[PDB]
Design a protein around this ligand. Structure first.
Ligand code: CLA
Ligand code: CLA
Ligand code: CLA
Ligand code: CLA
Ligand code: CLA
Ligand code: CLA
Ligand code: CLA
Ligand code: CLA
Ligand SMILES: CCCCCCCCCCCCCCCC(=O)OC[C@H](COP(=O)(O)OC[C@@H](O)CO)OC(=O)CCCCCCCCCCCCCCC
Ligand SMILES: CC1=C(/C=C/C(C)=C\C=C\C(C)=C\C=C\C=C(C)/C=C/C=C(C)/C=C/C2=C(C)CCCC2(C)C)C(C)(C)CCC1
Lengths: 742, 73, 222, 211, 42
């Protein structure tokens, strides 16, 4: 069956190699005859599958690499907790979080950057932050710098431990194949073990530490004399004072009359007006139910005993009439090629990151989070960016799998075979859908702008003119606002407040959430999003499906994954490798994310965020001009892009001045990218040649023969600089604007 | 670049405030603020949801530029 | 081999090498396809021996003081449950002939000396009888197997007279008493975590009143 | 020159362990303790040996200068107060003049010694009247009646390696003592004898864990 | 040992330490001579 088989001490911890670069690649280890060697060295370091031919060694290598990654993550967490401990105003922030700006970074007074340590309130000076740690540290009842300090220490310990574990598992006790390739027990554990018990232990930490101290702070007390956590579990009488049921030990649970615990485990829903956040009772019930669900899920597959399924015994049964034999053998494909798994997991992880970004703003989990505007905004846009990048990586590695490790002779399948057998139909129909959406979602904006600039407003696309109504969205919102009436009696309000029914939650003269109406502008922006997503999918899916062989080049696969072209023959064959398909799709994903985040910023600052008067009149941060100025590109310039770019541009000579400076460098690089994206190579090669002559004239010609970057590396550096410029520009814009006005 | 320089110089001289040019023309952000941002504010409001103006064409044409250019990429 | 809840992965390596193999291992840890460091069957027998011995000593000692206090002449100055002796600060403490912490690190250093030397012997058997040790050198060679050291330092009276059978009896006795002491220790500690009054007083209770049956209450308290 | 190879002649710092092969034990004070294997190559080995000897001698002098005046303050006639605060004590001259003079003279001396290390025997001070043949060197042990006028480092009073062993062991101990004194003054605010007596009075509690 | 020496002589780490030292020198000069615009020595 399945056992603990491993091997002993393959590679010794000897520095013999560190002084010899490129030991892994036979060609690289010979020596740098030119300068392209030092590019090619970094370029293929992590390329494990091109260093061997057996999956055992590359599996060991990736097992060690995961430990390296985890060590870096732990070190980052430790740095964060430290800087919170020794360099923040966290205690003053806890004193009253309504109007005290979270700052967690000071700068040394050397070169005039003292102005960076701007006024943040609470007798502190420091660069304001928007990471949003403080809402978490108030949720977990840290409420003391000693806790941050010791947590940073423990994080450092875990980091060193993981680094050790890595070194040991690669060098000394290397796992074997029948361990890795055994996915049944891995699924079994990770379902039951990691996620379930994780959520369970967190529910523990919440019901036994957070809930009481948070309730006390909501009652209003200086956290100095707030009783320490362990003094809430050792002596029961405190929790007894809080929750009568909680003073009944464990009888009401075991004896199946769970309703007694109804006080601290409940299903209220909505938000908590004391902090706008979620009712921690609800989130505790959530984490606990999720723990139980993962535990009961974990027991699916047979591992050693006689019960349970087998991932081979599940696929082959499914075989429909149209497709034929079904998923037979697919189990072998997804167990014999790492790149396949990397692609699948990257896709699912990007999608989950996006849905996390979405669910965050509309249901603020933490307390006093939906009122620190910049934090909410920055979190949402960061998660969106991460999701986009993960998705593109998924597509790229899927293409790499399609090229290298796919083969019908032994890694056969009858499903993917059919899929590839009609690729042309797929790409054609997706292309036509892309054209259709492009037309009927952007030409609408063009028509609206034109009919505006021609003095014919009553022929526009808006509520006051020829009208388009997003009826399905309002239908769903009505349903979600009337569902807690009959369908979900156990709830108290709608699942969130953004559903089109209820009241508004406002703390400290500022609003946090309220109903959200949808106008024709929302219809148009949603169709823009749909179109751009469809085009990115078109690019990447075409790349994957045509990575093997196209009707232009018959044997593309033999030429490898990443090569620049196939010469200028047959009318020119530039950018045919799947690698170049990903190079293209990157820009379109960037554009999709950019327009999405702009739409989000405008919609929030024009319909939700803002301040509330003493009487109750709302005056939003931007005045609520969305439904009347999002329908013209010229509007986007005037109402949003130009106007709300003030705070970044007057930012010189103030605390926010750093956000100003980047706003130029971001643009600059942004420029710079074109120089690599537009030019070619031969020109630069000849220029380098003349420069080498000019040097050689002075007996300075270096033996590391200069060489203009190879084509693929040129495109890579170009796209990297371009993404950097764009993202840094929107980053500076967002931070400066929101943290200045809000 | 040449035409930027000439146009900013003259558009300051005509309003009699060459002082502003001489002060805030030495730092790029000064160019992006005093020359482009401000002097474009009469343009981008050529046509708004409250009507249009004589400047309409230019505003329209202006955007036209920032489109055709992009298509070149 | 009195089979109580065995399996086949047990019998893959539990072929009767440990003194008195009963055949009880559903999981099948030490399967010898790849010998896991510290999962070696030799190491497993070593571990059961060492653990059971420590548990015997602990079950005697933790219970000794208060118990003796009952109708004995060890003063009531130490009439305290083992889990209230001071090892569990949320229960009790005591003023000793030093402070708590330095005492702990000192005893840790001593036990570390002993067990480090024992482990070094484990790796290289007999190899302690070479280096200068201010005497004691001509004793620590052991009886070959680190499992069973022997030696007049650890064989004073003299048993297993001319025999391996007597050693087999004495030794079965060892495994049985180790497992029994393990059970008793674990039970005392669980009562302590759930009852809260102390083992010997629990006997004081369960001598007369049968109705106790505190699994019925399942009351979880400090 | 006597060798201490493996076996009973080699009491290993870690019983039951084979010492690193490139740790022969020639250098007195060796026990086969280099898990990091810094002494892997011989040039590094001799360099580190010289560094160790110098550190040991300087640490002996430093710990003597700490200890003796403080106890002669505690009970003796003259009261030399906190040595750690004697660094900022006020003298006839400023500390920077002292620093530059120290640096000049010590640079002179240690540079001559440095050249002797790089080039043995080429920089030595050992006069030669006629017909009396001088001794050689073993760098780290200059010899001649300038630094060995008692004729101790050569033979008669003790086999050499034993005395060098005494020296290196006491030097390691003195290094520990100096770092301990400094770290204590970082934590506590007294001298070494004060901490000593405080520990004597209350061994059970008056420790690092006293707070 | 000598292997780690030849590794340390590889341009990345040497360059990082050299640049760190140079930057430290420059920032220390700036500390000891704030804003240092002219050459007020001759
Ligand atoms: C998350 C960061 C990360 C991690 C975990 C790794 C992990 C790894 N890299 Mg690596 N690498 C990275 C980023 C990373 N890389 C980046 C950004 C570059 C620049 C492009 C490189 C360039 C690079 C080269 C050129 C080589 C590696 C190699 C390796 C492997 C052995 C390295 C080792 O044991 O050093 C251990 C180091 C320490 C314990 C401390 C040193 C300080 C290992 C899989 C080597 C390899 O796989 O060769 C087959 C190799 O030759 N890396
Ligand atoms: C956890 C996810 C993950 C993992 C394990 C890998 C791992 C790998 N990728 Mg990959 N990739 C990912 C995410 C990931 N990537 C994502 C999200 C994208 C989309 C942006 C890509 C896009 C991508 C491409 C387009 C290519 C790879 C390649 C590779 C392989 C060689 C790595 C290399 O040359 O970089 C070495 C390290 C560097 C070059 C450092 C770059 C640092 C950046 C550019 C600076 C800017 C950062 C601020 C390696 C197996 C290459 C490959 O297989 O070659 C045959 C390849 O062509 N990947
Ligand atoms: C530290 C705890 C410990 C460890 C490591 C082992 C270790 C082992 N036991 Mg074990 N065992 C223990 C406590 C332990 N036992 C206790 C407390 C009992 C009493 C219920 C038993 C009863 C027991 C039986 C009945 C059997 C084992 C067996 C084995 C085997 C393996 C060496 C098997 C055996 O005989 O060893 C080969 C076997 O059949 N165990
Ligand atoms: C592994 C065996 C073991 C361990 C760890 C302990 C542990 C302990 N015993 Mg103990 N004890 C044991 C076996 C053990 N006992 C046995 C078998 C007996 C019967 C003779 C006793 C009789 C006993 C008495 C009478 C007392 C302790 C006490 C103590 C505590 C202080 C230790 C002490 O006096 O310092 C050792 C002191 C030296 C000077 C050396 C400590 C919890 C003391 C205490 O506070 O009671 C709980 C105490 O007064 N023990
Ligand atoms: C009470 C039951 C019991 C019976 C034996 C039986 C034996 N032990 Mg033993 N032992 C026990 C408990 C027991 N042990 C405990 C709780 C610790 C030890 C520690 C121990 C050591 C340290 C040594 C023995 C040795 C011996 C042997 C003489 C004999 C097989 C000796 C031995 O292994 O002889 C070869 C020996 O040196 N025992
Ligand atoms: C080793 C044998 C042993 C013996 C003689 C007892 C004896 C007793 N147990 Mg006990 N117990 C044992 C093992 C044992 N237990 C183990 C291994 C566990 C862990 C599951 C427990 C857990 C346990 C609980 C949770 C409780 C007892 C209780 C009791 C008392 C009724 C009685 C004195 C009850 C009590 O409160 O005792 C006063 C009680 O509530 N036991
Ligand atoms: C390890 C090097 C070292 C260093 C840097 C110092 C440094 C110092 N010693 Mg000193 N000392 C040392 C070792 C050292 N000691 C040793 C090993 C001893 C022998 C126990 C002494 C014995 C000693 C005495 C007796 C006195 C000093 C004094 C002093 C101080 C002024 C020097 C002076 O005026 O004396 C000049 C003396 C010369 C012989 C020249 C100064 C802080 C003096 C002091 O505390 O200030 C009044 C002082 O009276 N030292
Ligand atoms: C020769 C070694 C040596 C000796 C004899 C002492 C002795 C002493 N130290 Mg000390 N110390 C040492 C090294 C030493 N230290 C080192 C290397 C450090 C740096 C980490 C310190 C840091 C230190 C602090 C911060 C404090 C003391 C204090 C004390 C005094 C009370 C004991 C105590 O609580 O500290 C116990 C000391 C330690 C835990 C340090 C561990 C390091 C040593 C080397 C332990 C190893 C033992 C040694 C090798 C074996 C004995 C060798 C020889 C003496 C026979 C006591 C006189 C306290 C004091 O001022 O007294 C009131 C105090 O607050 N020590
Ligand atoms: C609805 O699809 C349902 C239909 C059912 O197919 P089968 O029952 O043969 O497939 C069995 C599944 O388990 C897939 O293997 O799927 C197809 O026929 C494939 C072609 C989809 C055509 C989609 C056109 C758009
Ligand atoms: C001083 C010097 C000089 C000059 C320099 C210059 C002129 C520079 C410039 C520069 C420019 C003109 C621009 C720049 C820019 C930069 C940037 C732009 C960066 C960035 C970075 C980063 C790192 C970012 C990041 C991020 C973001 C923000 C987004 C996404 C996320 C993350 C976080 C990634 C000379 C030559 C005289 C000499 C040498 C030195």
């Amino acid at each position: 069956e399945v056992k603990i088989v491993v091997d002993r001490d393959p590679v010794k911890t000897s520095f013999e190699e560190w002084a010899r670069p490129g030991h892994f690649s036979r060609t690289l280890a010979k020596g740098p005859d030119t300068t392209t060697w030092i590019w090619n060295l970094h370029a293929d370091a992590h390329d494990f599958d091109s260093h061997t031919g057996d999956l055992e060694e590359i599996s060991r290598k990736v097992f060690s690499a995961h430990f390296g990654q985890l060590s870096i993550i732990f070190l980052w967490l430790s740095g964060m907790y430290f800087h919170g401990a020794r360099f923040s105003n966290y205690e003053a922030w806890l004193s009253d979080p309504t109007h005290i700006g979270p700052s967690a970074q000071v700068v040394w007074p050397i070169v005039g950057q003292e102005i960076l340590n701007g006024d943040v309130g609470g007798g502190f000076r420091g660069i304001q932050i928007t990471s949003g740690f403080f809402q978490l540290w108030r949720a977990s009842g840290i409420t003391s710098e000693l806790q941050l300090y010791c947590t940073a220490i423990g994080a450092l310990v875990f980091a060193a431990l993981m680094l050790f574990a890595g070194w040991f598992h690669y060098h000394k006790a290397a796992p074997k194949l029948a361990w890795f390739q055994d996915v049944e027990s891995m699924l079994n554990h990770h379902l039951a073990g990691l996620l379930g018990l994780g959520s369970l232990s967190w529910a523990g930490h919440q019901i036994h530490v957070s809930l009481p101290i948070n309730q006390f702070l909501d009652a209003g007390v200086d956290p100095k004399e707030i009783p320490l956590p362990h003094e809430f579990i050792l002596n029961r009488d405190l929790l007894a004072q809080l929750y009568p049921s909680f003073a009944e030990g464990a009888t009401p649970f075991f004896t199946l009359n769970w309703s007694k615990y109804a006080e601290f485990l409940t299903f209220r829903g909505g938000l908590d007006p004391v902090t706008g956040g979620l009712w921690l009772t609800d989130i505790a019930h959530h984490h606990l139910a999720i723990a139980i669900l993962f535990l009961i899920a974990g027991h699916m597959y047979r591992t050693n005993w006689g019960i349970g399924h087998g991932l081979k015994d599940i696929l082959e049964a499914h075989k429909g009439p149209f497709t034929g034999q079904g998923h037979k053998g697919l189990y072998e494909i997804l167990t014999t090629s790492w790149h396949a798994q990397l692609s699948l997991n990257l896709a699912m992880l990007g999608s989950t990151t996006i849905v996390v970004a979405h669910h965050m703003y509309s249901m603020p989990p933490y307390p006093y989070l939906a009122t620190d505007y910049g934090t909410q905004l920055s979190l949402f846009t960061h998660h969106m960016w991460i999701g986009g990048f993960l998705i593109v990586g998924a597509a790229a590695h899927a293409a790499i799998f399609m090229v290298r490790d796919y083969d019908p002779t032994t890694r056969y399948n009858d499903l993917l075979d059919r899929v590839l057998r009609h690729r042309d139909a797929i790409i054609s129909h997706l292309n036509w859908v892309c054209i259709f959406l492009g037309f009927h979602s952007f030409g609408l904006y063009i028509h609206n702008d034109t009919m505006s600039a021609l003095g014919r407003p009553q022929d526009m696309f808006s509520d006051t003119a020829i009208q388009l109504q997003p009826i399905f969205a309002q239908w769903v919102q009505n349903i979600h606002a009337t569902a807690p009436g009959v369908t979900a009696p156990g709830a108290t309000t709608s699942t969130s407040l953004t559903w089109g029914g209820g009241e508004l939650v406002a703390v400290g003269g500022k609003v946090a959430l309220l109903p959200i109406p949808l106008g024709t502008a929302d219809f148009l922006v949603h169709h823009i999003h749909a179109f751009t997503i469809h085009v990115t999918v078109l690019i990447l899916l075409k790349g994957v499906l045509f990575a093997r062989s196209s009707r232009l080049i018959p044997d593309k696969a033999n030429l490898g994954f990443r090569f620049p072209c196939d010469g200028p023959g047959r009318g020119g064959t530039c950018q045919v490798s799947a690698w170049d398909h990903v190079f293209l799709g990157l820009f379109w994903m960037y554009n999709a994310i950019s327009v999405v985040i702009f739409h989000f910023s405008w919609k929030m600052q024009s319909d939700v965020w803002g301040t509330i008067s003493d009487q109750g009149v709302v005056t939003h941060i931007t005045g609520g001009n969305f439904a009347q100025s999002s329908i013209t590109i010229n509007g986007w310039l005037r109402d949003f892009l130009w106007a709300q770019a003030s705070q970044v541009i007057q930012s010189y000579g103030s605390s926010l001045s750093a956000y100003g400076l980047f706003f130029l460098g971001a643009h600059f690089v942004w420029a710079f990218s074109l120089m690599f994206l537009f030019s070619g190579r031969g020109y630069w090669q000849e220029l380098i040649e003349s420069i080498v002559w000019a040097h050689n004239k002075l007996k300075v010609a270096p033996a590391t023969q200069p060489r203009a970057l190879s084509i693929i590396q040129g495109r890579a550096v170009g796209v990297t600089h371009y993404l950097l410029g764009g993202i840094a520009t929107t980053w500076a814009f967002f931070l400066a604007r929101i943290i200045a006005v809000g | 670049w040449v035409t930027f320089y000439w146009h900013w110089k003259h558009i300051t001289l005509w309003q009699g405030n060459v002082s502003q040019f001489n002060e805030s023309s030495t730092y790029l952000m000064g160019w992006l603020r005093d020359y482009l941002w401000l002097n474009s504010s009469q343009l981008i409001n050529g046509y708004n949801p409250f009507g249009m103006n004589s400047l309409s064409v230019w505003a329209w044409m202006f955007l036209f530029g920032h489109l055709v250019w992009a298509t070149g990429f | 081999r009195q089979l109580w809840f065995a399996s086949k992965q047990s019998l893959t390596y539990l072929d009767g090498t440990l003194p008195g193999d009963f055949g009880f291992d559903p999981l099948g840890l030490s399967d010898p396809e790849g010998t896991g460091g510290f999962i070696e069957p030799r190491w497993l027998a070593y571990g059961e021996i060492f653990n059971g011995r420590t548990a015997m000593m602990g079950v005697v000692g933790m219970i000794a003081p208060e118990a003796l206090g009952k109708v004995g002449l060890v003063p009531p100055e130490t009439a305290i449950p083992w889990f209230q002796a001071g090892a569990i600060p949320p229960a009790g403490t005591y003023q000793y002939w030093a402070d708590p912490y330095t005492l702990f690190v000192f005893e840790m250093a001593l036990i570390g000396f002993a067990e480090h030397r024992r482990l070094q012997d484990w790796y290289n058997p007999g190899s302690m009888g070479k280096q200068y040790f201010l005497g004691l050198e001509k004793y620590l060679g052991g009886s070959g197997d680190p499992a069973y050291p022997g030696g007049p330092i650890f064989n004073p009276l003299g048993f297993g007279t001319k025999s391996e059978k007597e050693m087999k009896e004495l030794k079965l006795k060892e495994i049985k008493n180790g497992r029994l002491a393990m059970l008793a220790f674990l039970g005392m500690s669980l009562q302590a975590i759930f009852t809260g009054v102390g083992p010997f007083q629990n006997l004081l209770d369960h001598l007369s009143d049968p109705v106790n049956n505190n699994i019925l209450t399942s009351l979880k308290f400090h | 020159t006597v060798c201490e190879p493996l076996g009973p002649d080699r009491p290993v710092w870690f019983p039951g362990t084979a010492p690193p092969p490139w740790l022969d034990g020639s250098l007195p004070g060796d026990f086969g303790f280099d898990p990091l294997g810094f002494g892997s190559e011989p040039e590094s080995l001799r360099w580190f040996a010289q560094a160790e000897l110098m550190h040991g001698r300087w640490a002996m002098l430093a710990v003597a200068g700490i200890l003796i005046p403080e106890i002669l303050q505690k009970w003796g006639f003259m009261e030399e107060f906190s040595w750690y605060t004697a660094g900022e004590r006020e003298y006839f001259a400023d500390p920077w003049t002292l620093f530059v003079t120290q640096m000049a003279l010590m640079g002179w001396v240690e540079g001559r010694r440095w050249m002797d290390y790089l080039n043995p025997g080429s920089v030595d001070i050992e006069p030669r009247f006629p017909n009396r043949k001088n001794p050689t060197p073993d760098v780290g042990y200059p010899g001649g009646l300038w630094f060995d006028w008692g004729n101790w480092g050569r033979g008669s009073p003790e086999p050499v390696m034993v005395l060098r062993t005494k020296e290196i062991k006491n030097g390691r101990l003195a290094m520990l003592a100096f770092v301990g004194f400094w770290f204590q003054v970082v934590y506590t605010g007294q001298g070494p004898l004060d901490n000593l007596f405080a520990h004597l009075a209350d061994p059970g509690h008056c420790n690092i864990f006293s707070a | 040992m000598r292997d780690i020496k030849t590794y340390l002589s590889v341009a990345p780490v040497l360059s990082t330490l050299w640049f760190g030292a140079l930057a430290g020198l420059l920032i220390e000069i700036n500390r000891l001579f704030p804003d240092a615009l002219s050459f007020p020595f001759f």
